[PDB]
Scaffold this active site. Structure first.
Site, PDB file in Angstrom:
ATOM      1  N   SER A 116       0.841  -1.208   0.000  1.00 21.13           N
ATOM      2  CA  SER A 116       0.000   0.000   0.000  1.00 21.13           C
ATOM      3  C   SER A 116       0.861   1.236   0.000  1.00 21.13           C
ATOM      4  O   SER A 116       1.661   1.440  -0.943  1.00 21.13           O
ATOM      5  CB  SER A 116      -1.146  -0.082   1.049  1.00 21.13           C
ATOM      6  OG  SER A 116      -2.200   0.897   0.672  1.00 21.13           O
ATOM      7  N   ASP A 171     -10.452  -5.132  -4.009  1.00 19.03           N
ATOM      8  CA  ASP A 171     -10.058  -4.019  -3.119  1.00 19.03           C
ATOM      9  C   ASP A 171     -10.985  -2.757  -3.251  1.00 19.03           C
ATOM     10  O   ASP A 171     -11.035  -2.101  -4.280  1.00 19.03           O
ATOM     11  CB  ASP A 171      -8.576  -3.624  -3.449  1.00 19.03           C
ATOM     12  CG  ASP A 171      -7.925  -2.697  -2.398  1.00 19.03           C
ATOM     13  OD1 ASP A 171      -8.577  -1.935  -1.689  1.00 19.03           O
ATOM     14  OD2 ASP A 171      -6.658  -2.791  -2.362  1.00 19.03           O
ATOM     15  N   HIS A 203      -8.148  -5.515   0.222  1.00 19.33           N
ATOM     16  CA  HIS A 203      -6.935  -4.679   0.586  1.00 19.33           C
ATOM     17  C   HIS A 203      -6.216  -5.427   1.701  1.00 19.33           C
ATOM     18  O   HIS A 203      -6.395  -5.100   2.900  1.00 19.33           O
ATOM     19  CB  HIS A 203      -7.298  -3.273   1.095  1.00 19.33           C
ATOM     20  CG  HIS A 203      -6.100  -2.331   1.174  1.00 19.33           C
ATOM     21  ND1 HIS A 203      -5.454  -1.878   0.030  1.00 19.33           N
ATOM     22  CD2 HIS A 203      -5.468  -1.758   2.224  1.00 19.33           C
ATOM     23  CE1 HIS A 203      -4.454  -1.095   0.363  1.00 19.33           C
ATOM     24  NE2 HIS A 203      -4.462  -0.956   1.698  1.00 19.33           N
TER      25      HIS A 203
END
Length: 222
Positions: A116, A171, A203
Site C-alpha cells: 500500500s 479491493d 486490501h
C-alpha cells in the site's frame, strides 16, 4: 528510523527493505506476514529490514498523528501527490539504503518494496533516486496521476529496476484500476513489470501473493 530486522539464516549478501502501509509499523508488518504464511518470511542470504515510519500528521485522518511514510490530500489517484512530504521521506530512506551500502551490500543487491503506502514510497525511491537497485515490488499500491515518478522516467535513458506489483481485484480502498493504470504508465515509460491480479482478494496480504513474491525475490537476488 526504528526497524525490525529478520536476519538471513547464513551469510548476509543482499537486503530486502520492505515498507509497511499507513498506520502500521515494521514489527506490525513482520507479524502480519508471519500470520499470513503461518511462519516467518525468511531467506538464506537476504536480510529483511522492516523500518517504522516516524509518527506524523496525516491529512486523511484530519491531521491526527499516524505512522505514515508521507501525507496524502485524499485517498484517490486523481489528486496530486504531496511531493514535499514524499521528498523528505526519500531523503530519510536514502540514509537507510546508504547504511546498508556502507555495510558491504552493493546497491544492486538491495530490493525495495512495500504494501500500500509503502509500495508507493518504494516506487518513488527506486525510479527517482536509486535506479540501480535490484528491483521494486508494490503490493496493493498505485501512483497518483502526474506523479514525479512519471516525469523522472520520461527523462531517464538507462536500464531501470523491474517492478513486481500485485493487487486484489476486490479491493475497495485502493481500486484495482488505479493500480493497473500505474502498471500501464510504467510499462509505457520503459519499466519492465510483472502485474498479478488476485480475484477475491481485497486490501490485504494473501499467502499465494506472498509465495509468488518470494519466488520473484529469489530471481532478483540470487
Amino acid at each position: 528510523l526504528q526497524r525490525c530486522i529478520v536476519s538471513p539464516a547464513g551469510r548476509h549478501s543482499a537486503s530486502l527493505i520492505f515498507l509497511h502501509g499507513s498506520g502500521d509499523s515494521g514489527q506490525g508488518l513482520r507479524m502480519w506476514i508471519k500470520q499470513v504464511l503461518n511462519q516467518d518470511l525468511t531467506f538464506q542470504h537476504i536480510k529483511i529490514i522492516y523500518p517504522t515510519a516516524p509518527p506524523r500528521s496525516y491529512t486523511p485522518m484530519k491531521g491526527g498523528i499516524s505512522n505514515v511514510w508521507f501525507d496524502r490530500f485524499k485517498i484517490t489517484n486523481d489528486c496530486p501527490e504531496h511531493l514535499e512530504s514524499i521528498d523528505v521521506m526519500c531523503q530519510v530512506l536514502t540514509d537507510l539504503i546508504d547504511e546498508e551500502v556502507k555495510s558491504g551490500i552493493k546497491k544492486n543487491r538491495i530490493l525495495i518494496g512495500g504494501f500500500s503506502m509503502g509500495g508507493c514510497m518504494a516506487m518513488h525511491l527506486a525510479y527517482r533516486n536509486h535506479q540501480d537497485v535490484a528491483g521494486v515490488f508494490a503490493l496493493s499500491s498505485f501512483l497518483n496521476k502526474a506523479s514525479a515518478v512519471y516525469q523522472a522516467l520520461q527523462k531517464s535513458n538507462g536500464v531501470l529496476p523491474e517492478l513486481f506489483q500485485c493487487h486484489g481485484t476486490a479491493d475497495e480502498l485502493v481500486l484495482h484500476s488505479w493500480a493497473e493504470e500505474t502498471n500501464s504508465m510504467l510499462k509505457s515509460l520503459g519499466v519492465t513489470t510483472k502485474f498479478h491480479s488476485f480475484p477475491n482478494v481485497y486490501h490485504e496480504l494473501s499467502k499465494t501473493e506472498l509465495d509468488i513474491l518470494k519466488l520473484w525475490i529469489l530471481t532478483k537476488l540470487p
